[PDB]
C-alpha cells in the first residue's frame, strides 16, 4: 500500500574531543538502506540493504558528497545554536534533522517533512502545506525569518514532491522483493504459573514485516486494554520485528480470553485462544 522514505541525522558535539560526531541513516518504510558515520574509517555513504549495493559509483560518490556536506552544515549549526542559547563551550549538545516523504497506496506524493530538534526539543519544522514554518522558541525565530526571506520552503517543496518521491518509487522497484513484501507474524501463547490462582498468558507476534501491528487481549470479548502489559515492537535484527501482550488470568478463566492479531501480512486478523 503506502510507503515512506526518511533520512535521520544526529550531530553531537565532543567539546575538547575532536569535531562533533555525525551519524546519518536512510530508511524506506522500516528498512534502513544507507548510513554515514563520521567516526568511521571509510568516510563514504555505505549500503545497508542488498538492493542498494548495485547502484553504481555515481550514486555512491554523489551521496557521499552530499552527506559530507550535511556533516559540515550540522557542525556549523551546533556552534550557531550554542550561541543562540548562550551556552558554554564545555557542554556536549545535539542537533537532529529529519526529512523525507510519504506516498499513498497509489504511489503519489502524500506528505513531506523537514525538521530539526536541539537537545531533544523541537527547533523548527516545515509545515504540512510545505509553504510555512512552525518556529519553536525565540531563537528559532531568527532561523524562521531567515528561511522565509531566502525562500527555503519552495526549494524544499520541489525536492519532497519531486526527487524524494521519485527515488522512493525507484527504490521500491529496485528492492521489490523485500520492500514490497509483507511477512505475517508467527503467533503463539505461553502460560506461566504466578500464584495458586493466577497465571500469565502471553501472546506472541514474531518474524513480521512491516513493523505496524495491533496485538490486544479480550475477556468475554470485552476490551482489556488497561489490564494488558504490551511491550514496544522490537527488531529481531534480521529485518523482522517482534511484540508481545500479556494478561494475568485468574486460574480457571483461560477460556474467557482471546488474543487478537492484526497485521498487513495476514489474510484475516487472528483470534488466538488458550485451549
Amino acid at each position: 500500500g503506502s510507503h515512506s522514505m526518511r533520512y535521520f541525522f544526529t550531530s553531537v558535539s565532543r567539546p575538547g574531543r575532536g569535531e562533533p560526531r555525525f551519524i546519518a541513516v536512510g530508511y524506506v518504510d522500516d528498512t534502513q538502506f544507507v548510513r554515514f558515520d563520521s567516526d568511521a574509517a571509510s568516510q563514504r555513504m555505505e549500503p545497508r540493504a542488498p538492493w542498494i549495493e548495485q547502484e553504481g559509483p555515481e550514486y555512491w560518490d554523489g551521496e557521499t558528497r552530499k552527506v559530507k556536506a550535511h556533516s559540515q552544515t550540522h557542525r556549523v549549526d551546533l556552534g550557531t545554536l550554542r550561541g543562540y542559547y548562550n551556552q558554554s563551550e564545555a557542554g556536549s549538545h545535539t542537533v537532529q534533522r529529519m526529512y523525507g516523504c510519504d506516498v499513498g497506496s497509489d504511489w503519489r506524493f502524500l506528505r513531506g517533512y523537514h525538521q530539526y530538534a536541539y537537545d531533544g526539543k523541537d527547533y523548527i519544522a516545515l509545515k504540512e502545506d510545505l509553504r510555512s514554518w512552525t518556529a519553536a522558541d525565540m531563537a528559532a525565530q531568527t532561523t524562521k525569518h531567515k528561511w522565509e526571506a531566502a525562500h527555503v520552503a519552495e526549494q524544499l517543496r520541489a525536492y519532497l514532491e519531486g526527487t524524494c518521491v521519485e527515488w522512493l518509487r525507484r527504490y521500491l522497484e529496485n528492492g521489490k522483493e523485500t520492500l514490497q513484501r509483507t511477512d505475517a507474524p508467527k503467533t503463539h501463547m505461553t502460560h506461566h504459573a504466578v500464584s495458586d490462582h493466577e497465571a500469565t498468558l502471553r501472546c506472541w507476534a514474531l518474524s513480521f514485516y512491516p513493523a505496524e501491528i495491533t496485538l490486544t487481549w479480550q475477556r468475554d470479548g470485552e476490551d482489556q486494554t488497561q489490564d494488558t502489559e504490551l511491550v514496544e515492537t522490537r527488531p529481531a535484527g534480521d529485518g523482522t520485528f517482534q511484540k508481545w501482550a500479556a494478561v494475568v488470568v485468574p486460574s480457571g478463566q483461560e477460556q474467557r480470553y482471546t488474543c487478537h492479531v492484526q497485521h498487513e501480512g495476514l489474510p484475516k486478523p487472528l483470534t488466538l485462544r488458550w485451549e
Binding site: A69, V76, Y123, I124, V152, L156, W167
Partner: peptide
Amino acid sequence: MLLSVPLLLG
C-alpha cells in the same frame, strides 16, 4: 536520495 538544497540554521 539526499536533499541537495544548501541549508544552515544561522
